[PDB]
Structures are given as C-alpha cells and as structure tokens.
Amino acid sequence: PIVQNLQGQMVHQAISPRTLNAWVKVVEEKAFSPEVIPMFSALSEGATPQDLNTMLNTVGGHQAAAQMLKETINEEAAEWDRLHPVHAGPIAPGQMREPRGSDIAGTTSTLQEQIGWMTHNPPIPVGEIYKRWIILGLNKIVRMYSPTSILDIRQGPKEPFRDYVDRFYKTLRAEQASQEVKNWMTETLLVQNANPDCKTILKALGPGATLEEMMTACQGV
Amino acid sequence: PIVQNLQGQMVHQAISPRTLNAWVKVVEEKAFSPEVIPMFSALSEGATPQDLNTMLNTVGGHQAAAQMLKETINEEAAEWDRLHPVHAGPIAPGQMREPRGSDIAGTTSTLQEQIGWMTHNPPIPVGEIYKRWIILGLNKIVRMYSPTSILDIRQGPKEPFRDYVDRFYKTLRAEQASQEVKNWMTETLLVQNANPDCKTILKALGPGATLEEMMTACQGV
C-alpha cells in the first residue's frame, strides 16, 4: 500500500508478513471457495501492483489456478492496450506517461512509477484495475473448482430451510450465471429443489414471494 | 337493585331468590372458569353494595376464593381512601357526604345512604365500583384456578381447528396477560401449537393473517 512519511510524501509500504500469511491461509485452506474472492478484496485493500504480484506468488504454487490467472491477466492487458493506444507526440512535463498492459500489472514497471500513477488529482487507479483483473481470474478459478452444479443443490429431508438457502446462494455465487439467469434460478429453482414440506409451503406462498417471506414461512419446518 | 314506587321515589329492591340461586349455581358448578365473570356481571346488573355482599356470601363457602376476594376488596378500598381523602370543612345541605372505602363496599353503610348515592344527577356509581372490585377479585380467582397454561394448549391430531381456537382463547381469557403479550400470543402461539396440517396451512397463509381467514382456511382440515 501507500502511506505518507513525515515529509508529506507518498511512499510505498510493503504488505505486512501476517497479511501475506492470512492470504496464504486463504489460498491453501479454502479450496477456492467463493468466499476467497471477498477476502482477497479485503486483504489487498489499497495495494500496489507489486504487492498484488507478491500475493499472486502464493497462487503460483497451484499450477492450474496460476495458469488460469496468468491467461486472464494477459487477456485483460491485451484488451487494455487495445483500448488505450500509445499516443505519438509531445508529453507535458507535469503530466506522467500512460502505463502499458505490462506496466499496470507490474511486470516491467517500477515502484516509483506506480506510486506516482496511483497518487494523483484526479487519481488513475492502476492497483484497482489490476485487482479487478485478479478478481476476474479468481472468479474463473472458483467456477472451475465448484464441486456441485446449482441444479444439484437440493434441500435434505431434515435440512433446515436456511441452510438450504445458504448452500443454494453459495453455489449460485460460485457459478456466476447471467443476471437474468440468476434471477430465474432464485425465483424458480430454489422452490423446485426444496424438500416436500417446504416445497408445499412455498407453492402455497405463490410466485413473486420475497426471500424474507419464504424464510419466514419455512422457519421451523 | 333500585326501583321506583308509586310515589316516584327510589327504593331498594332485594335480589330475587332465583337470581341468587342462579349465582349459587354459577359459583358451585363452574369451578371458577372465565365465563363466571361475564355471568356475574349479568346477574349483578344494577345492584347495590348490600346486594353484592349477599352475592359474595355464596363465595364465602369457598374459603380460598373468599379470602382472595376479601384481600382484593380491602386493597381497592385502601386505594380508594388514599385517592379520595376526607375533606375537612363545611358540607352543603343539598349535597350528600362522600362514602369511605368501608362504606362503598357496604360493610358499614346503610341501605338509604347507598340508594341516595347511586341515584343522583349526575350519579356517582358506588355499586358499579364495588362490582369492578369484585370483578378484579374474580379475575384473580380465575387465574388461580386455571388448569392449563396457554403454552400447553395444543391442537389435537384430529381436533377441529375451531375447537382448538376456542380452547386457546378461553385459556387466554383465564390467564389475563398484558395486552401486548396477548397480541403476541394470538399472533404466534396459536399457529405454533396447531396440529401439523393446520400448521402447514397457517404457515402458508403468512404472518398477519386475520383470525377469520385462519379459521376459513382450516375449516374442514
């Protein structure tokens, strides 16, 4: 991340060892469950591309996931280069140059360049964009590692309704379908795959019932 | 009660023997069920404190209930004396004096005093206040004699829903909880303690369903 020294200057600060160890635990203990994605977003808060690559080195041990991440990052960098062509001409002395795809990801750039790019009025977030590419890669990995399809999430005969809803929504978050498809799933498949008692109650509740009403009517069933 | 003679004067009339016998039957045959309270209110309609004490003599055989009634009446009389201090000074010749706690209950007062106190423009009801104290005592007795808690009123596997509702509301009337607590009971516990089929139907009906809708949806179940 970026901090301020006693002179009021922006200086890069390395990720603390225990934050890196928390990220390592997340990678090595959660088997790329969907919750890995928010946690990363919390653990890389306000990070620099060098810090993001340091965090990615933990994923580098997982060869398949690391390869998927590298493919996603390369594709995003190519798209960024395509959408941000290198302008030919004079550059203002007070304005910094435009980083390339290999520079925003920190493969070739230096620390001072990223510090200057991130701290500006208005700021151009390179760390945030690299983080978004990382999150895209992580979402792909979570989809790859999902053990069950949403069509296979069925409420158990004695399973409480809240646990079934939690499993259903966790699987839905893992699968990352289209928004309309997700809405159709939450409206139809959740009722369809419930156990007979909750299914009867939800059918009696009618279409268009909110999730709160559904969980209320099935609370102790 | 109070009637009018041929001269247009208010004269006390004794309670008829069959009204007293009806009250005796209520006391001795209904085991201080909640319905004893409305019936008393019907049987003592427009009564004088002497008449109310005559009716209480039937309860005097039931030692515990009579003691509870006497405690309630004494407490109410003490509160009445506290809230109605005896004024020191002149009294208007045309205005009658203020009865005390032992006088409104008819322990020390006479018949003519109560007749004059009750018949006035505007009237000051002493019989009605004594009746309200009696009803407080009777409510305490009904609470004491209640055989079942409201938490123990559960619909039978083959019991019709209307009978379960009647038992539930009778027990609720016996227990005399706070108004908010009673509302919570009628909204939640009635559904909670129903049998599985009616419970499923009521859960499908949703929260905030009126009692009429609940009894309609469970009519033949």
Give the number of other Cβ atoms within 10 Å of residue B106's Cβ.
23
Measured between CA atoms, the residue of chain B closest to residue A197 is B200
* Radius of gyration from C-alpha coordinates of chain A: 23
Q: How far is B45 from chain A (nearest CA, A)?
A: 48
Q: In chain A, whose CA is at the least distance from the CA of B205?
A: A205
Backbone phi and psi for residue B210, each to the nearest 5 degrees, phi listed first: -70, 160
Asked if the Cβ–Cβ distance from A200 to B204 is below 8 Å, we say yes
- The parent domain of residue A122 ranges over 2-145
CA atoms within 13 A on the CB side of B153: 25
The one-letter amino acid code at A197 reads: D
- For chains A and B, count residue pairs whose Cβ atoms are closer than 8 Å: 20
Q: How far is B207 from chain A (nearest CA, A)?
A: 8
Which residues are bridge partners to A3 per DSSP? Answer: A11
CB contact under 8 A, B207 and A216: yes
Cβ distance B203 to A213 less than 8 Å, yes or no, reads no
Partner residue facing B200 (CB), from A201, A213, A216: A201
A-chain residues near B201 (CB < 8 A): 204
Q: Do A213 and B200 touch (CB under 8 A)?
A: no
- Please give the resolution of this entry in Å, rounded to 1 decimal: 3.1
Judged by a CB distance cut-off of 8 A, whether residue A215 touches chain B is no
CB B80 within 8 A of CB B133: no
Interatomic CA distance for residues A40 and A30, integer angstroms: 12
Side chain identity at A14, as an amino acid letter?
A
Peptide bond into B122 cis (omega under 30): yes
In chain A, which ranges are continuous DSSP H helix? 17-29, 36-43, 49-59, 63-83, 101-104, 111-118, 126-145, 161-175, 179-184, 190-192, 196-205, 211-217
* Whether A218 and B203 lie within 8 Å, measured CB to CB: yes
Q: Is B97 annotated as a binding residue?
A: no
Contacts of A216 in chain B (CB under 8 A): 206-207
A132 C-beta neighbours (distance < 10 Å), count: 13
Q: Is residue A204 within 8 angstroms of chain B, CB to CB? A: yes
Q: Which chain B residues are Cβ-neighbours of A205 within 8 angstroms?
A: 204, 206
CA-to-CA dists, residue B3 to B15, B50, B118, angstroms: 12, 15, 12
CATH code, domain with A86:
1.10.375.10
Contact B36, B23 (CB under 8 A): no
